[PDB]
Design a protein around this ligand. Structure first.
Ligand SMILES: N#Cc1ccc2cc3c(=O)[nH]c(=O)nc-3n(-c3ccc(O)cc3)c2c1
Ligand SMILES: [Mn+2]
Length: 248
């Protein structure tokens, strides 16, 4: 089994940041995931995580401006190695962060990214998605590969990339597209952006590679839906909490 959260925690919002980081660390302590994949981290936010989620090792690649990180629960997850796959044509300092780990006697390749944002950068986001999916297929065959991140995907962008390969699956699709976690960026239900228009999108996604009768998703749920004391949520995104298990 592996449990993890992926969450774009909007470190670029300076308003209520310490309280919101507290909110995120409260969720980490309550759900106690093995791994946390984070996007839109900024330097002060890391400092907060070191004090208030100290039993997670913070793995980063480049830290310029805002960045991703993979948090590994100490004593559960053993760090083996890291690989950074660049997106040569990014205009937003985006890249693919890979961490090989051991957990429960099994080897994992854990991946995250914040793919190119906005509708205007669709074509580059699609190119980056293709890079991510190719990298997932190249991992050694005895490794469980999990991507979890802020893909910024919408509409038919997955199809335009050539589709998910035959051996890669979207965890939400695999569970039958449940409604309760169908949107991860929802401006009707989330008030952190003070914006008039309704938008419900599923930016945050989890892909996993098939390994024929081993780990599969057992649950998927939103996190971050409790308002904090300031009347806002931890992030403008909802996080995703996912567990995979082996069903023989
Ligand atoms: N402000 C605002 C605002 C309001 C409404 C929408 C609605 C959509 C939609 O229906 N489809 C879509 O693909 N993207 C939408 N964005 C969006 C979201 C992030 C983004 O970086 C760029 C556009 C919106 C943004
Ligand atoms: Mn943001």
């Amino acid at each position: 089994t592996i449990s993890f959260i992926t969450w774009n925690i909007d470190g670029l919002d300076g308003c209520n940041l310490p309280e919101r980081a507290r909110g995120v660390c409260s969720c980490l302590a309550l759900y106690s995931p093995d791994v946390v994949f984070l996007q839109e981290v900024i330097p002060p936010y890391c400092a907060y995580l070191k004090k208030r989620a100290a039993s997670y090792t913070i793995i980063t690649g480049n830290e310029e401006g805002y960045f991703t990180a993979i948090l590994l629960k100490k004593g559960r997850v053993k760090f083996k190695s890291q690989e950074i796959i660049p997106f040569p044509n990014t205009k937003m300092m985006r890249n693919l962060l890979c961490v090989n780990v051991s957990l429960g006697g099994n080897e994992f390749c854990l991946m995250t990214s914040h793919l190119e944002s906005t509708r205007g950068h669709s074509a580059e986001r699609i190119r980056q998605l293709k890079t991510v999916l190719g990298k997932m297929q190249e991992a050694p065959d005895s490794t469980t590969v999990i991507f979890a991140g802020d893909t910024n995907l919408r509409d038919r962008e997955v199809i335009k990339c050539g589709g998910l390969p035959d051996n890669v699956f979207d965890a939400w699709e695999f569970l039958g597209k449940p409604k309760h976690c169908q949107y991860t960026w929802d401006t009707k239900a989330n008030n952190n952006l003070r914006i008039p228009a309704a938008c419900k999108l599923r930016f945050d996604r989890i892909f996993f590679r098939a390994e024929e009768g081993h780990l599969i998703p057992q649950s998927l749920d939103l996190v971050g839906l409790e308002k904090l004391d300031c009347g806002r949520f931890p992030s403008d995104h909802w996080g995703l909490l996912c567990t995979l298990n082996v069903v023989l």
